[PDB]
């Protein structure tokens, strides 16, 4: 699933509130 994979990358960046 594209969105799930993209999110995994961005969670690692940790640039916006969770």
């Amino acid at each position, epitope marked *: 699933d594209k*969105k799930q*994979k*993209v*999110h995994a990358l*961005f969670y690692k*960046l*940790d*640039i*916006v509130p969770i």
Partner: antibody
Amino acid sequence: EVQLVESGGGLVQPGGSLRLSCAASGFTFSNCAMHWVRQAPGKGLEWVAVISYHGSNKYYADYVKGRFTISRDNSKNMLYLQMNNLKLEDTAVYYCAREGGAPSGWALDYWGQGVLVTVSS
Amino acid sequence: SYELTQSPSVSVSPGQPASITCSGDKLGDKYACWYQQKPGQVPVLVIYEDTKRPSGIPERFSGSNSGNTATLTISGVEAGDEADYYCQAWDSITHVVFGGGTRLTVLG
């Protein structure tokens, strides 16, 4: 009603230093990641750096090589870029931009008006 | 670095939709955005998350991403749509990358 007003451009010699400023208003600044992007006159857009909503994590383009530093003041709604050891190829209009896509990818949804940085002997 | 290949110049003929492509290895695994920059203006976000439009962007602007190709399409082309269009995504360590930009000429 978002606004991003920049200042701090001008002329600087090779090897010199300059600090850019980006004043934000019209949105909760401290909840958003923020970018700098640059554009050499008559050329294309080139990303510079991004900083996290509360300022911990910072990431930079390959050419920065530790010479630039992105920072923010969430109590004054200010974003900064300190540029050191500048080179002729760093001449460009520098924009600040709000992030609005993350975590669903990048999306620079609002851009400041831009200020020109000229590096010249 | 990464990639993002854009044709530097595109022309659209009277009555046709405009089509602007953006290719990169693995691009379909990433989300593409598109920025419009009119002369002397700052860039404006027109597409994000491959296909989505910010509020105030007309629906005649559409975006897609499949395989290695992201595409911006403009129906109901007007002379006011002449601008430079930049696609963007990210490289191998999730750093923002822009395409070279495409200058759109509206013929006729």
